Amino acid sequence: QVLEGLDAVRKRPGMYIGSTDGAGLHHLVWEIVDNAVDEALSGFGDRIDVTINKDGSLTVQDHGRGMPTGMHAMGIPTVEVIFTILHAVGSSVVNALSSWLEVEITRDGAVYKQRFENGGKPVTTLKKIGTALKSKTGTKVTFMPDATIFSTTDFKYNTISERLNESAFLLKNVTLSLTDKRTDEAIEFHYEN
Numbered sequence: 001q002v003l004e005g006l007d008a009v010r011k012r013p014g015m016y017i018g019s020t021d022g023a024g025l026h027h028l029v030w031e032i033v034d035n036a037v038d039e040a041l042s043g044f045g046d047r048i049d050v051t052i053n054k055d056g057s058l059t060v061q062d063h064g065r066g067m068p069t070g071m072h073a074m075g076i077p078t079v080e081v082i083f084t085i086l087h088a089v090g091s092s093v094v095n096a097l098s099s100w101l102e103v104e105i106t107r108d109g110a111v112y113k114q115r116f117e118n119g120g121k122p123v124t125t126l127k128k129i130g131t132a133l134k135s136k137t138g139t140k141v142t143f144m145p146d147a148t149i150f151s152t153t154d155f156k157y158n159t160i161s162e163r164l165n166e167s168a169f170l171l172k173n174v175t176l177s178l179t180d181k182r183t184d185e186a187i188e189f190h191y192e193n
């Protein structure tokens with residue numbers, strides 16, 4: 001296993017997301033959503049909320065365990081390693097192809113945040129920004145796709161809606177929501193089994 005930096009993704013995006021058109025743009029959404037879905041499949045969290053923001057960014061929020069908030073080697077947060085090392089993997093690929101990305105983790109009565117810019121360069125460490133009830137847990141990722149890479153940066157509500165509907169059907173007993181702040185459109189999916 002040869003590890004790589006995020007430059008490898010930026011120099012050959014098609015290798016990681018297939019293309020740099022709308023299909024590729026939406027692959028970024030699928031990668032982050034799949035991380036939330038994997039967590040829910042393991043039994044942590046029963047709702048996943050996706051928001052298309054007015055500024056063109058996209059947020060995915062789950063109510064799972066929260067990404068690990070501890071340290072790797074050299075005092076580097078585990079979350080930084082997940083988002084900045086390519087193990088050629090979704091999180092790092094999305095970060096590499098975003099002009100900015102924020103990850104917010106809630107667990108153990110604390111809310112933590114790390115911000116990356118310009119293809120996944122950290123501009124903060126993982127810092128405690130607030131507190132929450134001990135019962136509150138989860139991960140929220142917001143990213144702005146890099147307009148220098150993609151030929152389109154317009155997320156398509158219908159495309160995402162269809163995917164989340166399908167994901168809700170495969171998961172069972174988990175609510176998937178989509179909200180578009182550009183148009184105010186909103187929908188929720190939930191399939192009981």
Ligand SMILES: CCNC(=O)Nc1cc(-c2nc(C(F)(F)F)cs2)c(-c2cncc(-c3n[nH]c(=O)o3)c2)cn1
Binds near residue numbers: 066
């Ligand atoms: C919005 C995107 N949503 C997202 O990305 N949510 C998300 C991601 C993760 C990842 N964690 C990892 C890695 F590598 F740190 F394990 C990769 S994704 C985990 C997670 C996975 N395994 C173990 C734990 C854990 N907490 N405590 C404990 O004992 O185990 C947590 C949970 N929620």
